[PDB]
Amino acid sequence: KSYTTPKKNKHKRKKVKLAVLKYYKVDENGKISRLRRECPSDECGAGVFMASHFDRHYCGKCCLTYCF
RNA sequence: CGGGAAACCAAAGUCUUUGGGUUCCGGGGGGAGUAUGGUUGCAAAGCUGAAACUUAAAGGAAUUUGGCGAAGGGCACCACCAGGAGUGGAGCCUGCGGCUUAAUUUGACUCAACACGGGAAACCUCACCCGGCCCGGACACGGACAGGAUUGACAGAUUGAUAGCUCUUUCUCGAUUCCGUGGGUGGUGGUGCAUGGCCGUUCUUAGUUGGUGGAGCGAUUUGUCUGGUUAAUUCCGAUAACGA
RNA sequence: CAGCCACCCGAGAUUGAGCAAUAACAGGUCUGUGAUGCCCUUAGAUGUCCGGGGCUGCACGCGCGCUACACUGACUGGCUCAGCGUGUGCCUACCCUACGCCGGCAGGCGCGGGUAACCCGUUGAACCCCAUUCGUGAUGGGGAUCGGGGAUUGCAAUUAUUCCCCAUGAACGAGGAAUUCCCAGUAAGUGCGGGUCAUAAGCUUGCGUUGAUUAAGUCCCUGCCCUUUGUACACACCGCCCGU
Numbered sequence: 001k002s003y004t005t006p007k008k009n010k011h012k013r014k015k016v017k018l019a020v021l022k023y024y025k026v027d028e029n030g031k032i033s034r035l036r037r038e039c040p041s042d043e044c045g046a047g048v049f050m051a052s053h054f055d056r057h058y059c060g061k062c063c064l065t066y067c068f
Numbered sequence: 069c070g071g072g073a074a075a076c077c078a079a080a081g082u083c084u085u086u087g088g089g090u091u092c093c094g095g096g097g098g099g100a101g102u103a104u105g106g107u108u109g110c111a112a113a114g115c116u117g118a119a120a121c122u123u124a125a126a127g128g129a130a131u132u133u134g135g136c137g138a139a140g141g142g143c144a145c146c147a148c149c150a151g152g153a154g155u156g157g158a159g160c161c162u163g164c165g166g167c168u169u170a171a172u173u174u175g176a177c178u179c180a181a182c183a184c185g186g187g188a189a190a191c192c193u194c195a196c197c198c199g200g201c202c203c204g205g206a207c208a209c210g211g212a213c214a215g216g217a218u219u220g221a222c223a224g225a226u227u228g229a230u231a232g233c234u235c236u237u238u239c240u241c242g243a244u245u246c247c248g249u250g251g252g253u254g255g256u257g258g259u260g261c262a263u264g265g266c267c268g269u270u271c272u273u274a275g276u277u278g279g280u281g282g283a284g285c286g287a288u289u290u291g292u293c294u295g296g297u298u299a300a301u302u303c304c305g306a307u308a309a310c311g312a
Numbered sequence: 313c314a315g316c317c318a319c320c321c322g323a324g325a326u327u328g329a330g331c332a333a334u335a336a337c338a339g340g341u342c343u344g345u346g347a348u349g350c351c352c353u354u355a356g357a358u359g360u361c362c363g364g365g366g367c368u369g370c371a372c373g374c375g376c377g378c379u380a381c382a383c384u385g386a387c388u389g390g391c392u393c394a395g396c397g398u399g400u401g402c403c404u405a406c407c408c409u410a411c412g413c414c415g416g417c418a419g420g421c422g423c424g425g426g427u428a429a430c431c432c433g434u435u436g437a438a439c440c441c442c443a444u445u446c447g448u449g450a451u452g453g454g455g456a457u458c459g460g461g462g463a464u465u466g467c468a469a470u471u472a473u474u475c476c477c478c479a480u481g482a483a484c485g486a487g488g489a490a491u492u493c494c495c496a497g498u499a500a501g502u503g504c505g506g507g508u509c510a511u512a513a514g515c516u517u518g519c520g521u522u523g524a525u526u527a528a529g530u531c532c533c534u535g536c537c538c539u540u541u542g543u544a545c546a547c548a549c550c551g552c553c554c555g556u
């Protein structure tokens with residue numbers, strides 16, 4: 001029920017639509033162009049990408065941060 | 069002998085196998101030996117004496133535990149005598165009550181609670197408190213679908229932590245899930261005055277019970293006792309009791 | 313008669329302990345359990361989990377225990393005698409120690425033994441015995457309180473976990489009313505094992521050494537059991553029942 005102390009809500013992940021639009025760029029030619037840097041770790045595959053931050057990228061379940 | 073409901077009775081006997089003669093007197097218990105009327109008396113008060121109403125009991129005899137401010141016995145170093153060590157007085161450890169505390173968690177209060185719960189706890193113990201995350205809400209019904217129902221986290225504000233528990237920021241797991249209702253699980257939450265089991269105490273004292281038979285209409289009683297002995301209802305013995 | 317006492321012979325002419333009848337307590341345990349009825353909670357938890365704290369906090373009152381008040385003694389050396397036991401784990405990592413060095417000390421590294429009458433271990437235990445110092449003085453009694461330093465256990469010792477070394481040296485002069493336990497290897501003075509245990513016993517249960525004074529009785533006190541008697545009680549005296 002409603003207690004005296006406030007409670008922060010859980011991390012409700014907002015649904016993002018048409019994410020498959022935002023992975024590759026499509027031109028008149030059939031050659032694709034990836035928009036994200038690829039993770040070279042052997043735990044994940046070659047189809048996964050990295051996170052899109054504003055300073056540096058971030059891998060998936062590998063949780064490895066690579067600088068420049 | 070006989071009789072009675074039995075205590076008991078040579079009369080309370082000679083009584084359904086009722087009948088010797090003759091006076092007074094009682095028909096559940098209260099109201100009530102009261103009111104009125106008469107009568108007797110100096111007075112107090114004696115004699116005769118109802119009804120209305122109310123109740124399903126009031127009473128008599130007698131056996132077993134019960135309870136005595138009744139009597140008589142027996143046993144016990146958790147009772148005493150004669151003694152030994154002592155405790156209670158001093159300091160320390162432990163437990164309980166009280167005060168105090170955000171909390172100082174709780175049960176047990178004469179034997180039969182207080183170094184007890186196998187309780188000598190720094191953290192787990194923990195059942196108590198200040199605080200924050202994980203779900204360990206199974207399974208069904210109805211909303212959302214592989215285009216995503218969510219878990220897993222990094223320069224920086226942040227408790228407490230590099231628990232991403234949040235907020236800047238999105239690849240990662242793919243139908244294993246999120247949401248409302250039934251329902252389910254977990255609970256050192258409450259009730260031992262609902263219990264089961266276990267244990268303690270009366271009691272570790274020496275006390276219980278049938279079979280046959282005797283007595284009484286019967287409940288019931290003797291056996292299980294006046295006495296002697298023993299740690300002992302342990303034996304002996306007097307004895308309608310023998311055998312267990 | 314049941315049996316009792318003393319004596320001779322003979323190891324013992326009463327060694328100790330386990331279970332312990334019918335019936336009953338509103339005795340204790342829902343905090344031993346996945347034994348459990350009902351009730352409460354269940355996502356923002358009364359479950360679970362983590363960090364830290366508190367069960368230990370003190371004007372005070374009570375019960376089990378330990379050390380003492382000393383010369384029947386304290387201190388310092390030497391002599392010499394035991395028995396129950398225990399000892400390397402499913403989860404699991406905490407086993408018992410001989411032997412040679414370092415250090416006054418607790419403790420530190422290697423060489424080993426034992427899955428056990430094999431190794432610790434002939435468990436060289438304490439009390440006791442012998443010889444000096446001390447001399448009735450709150451004193452070499454008593455060791456509370458406390459300061460500094462050094463080690464082990466563990467992630468963490470502060471509200472000293474514990475141990476060791478040096479200082480500190482209070483109360484206490486055999487204790488009021490009251491009260492506990494005990495008849496022979498008994499009480500008592502002493503030590504050693506087991507449980508608790510990561511470090512650990514002023515507690516409990518066992519083992520062993522030295523080892524007595526008094527009693528072979530009673531119902532006075534404290535309780536229990538039984539017989540006789542009385543009952544207007546049978547919810548049983550916490551009973552029944554009279555009157556304004």
Ligand SMILES: [Zn+2]
Nearest residue numbers: 039041044062
């Ligand atoms: Zn990767």
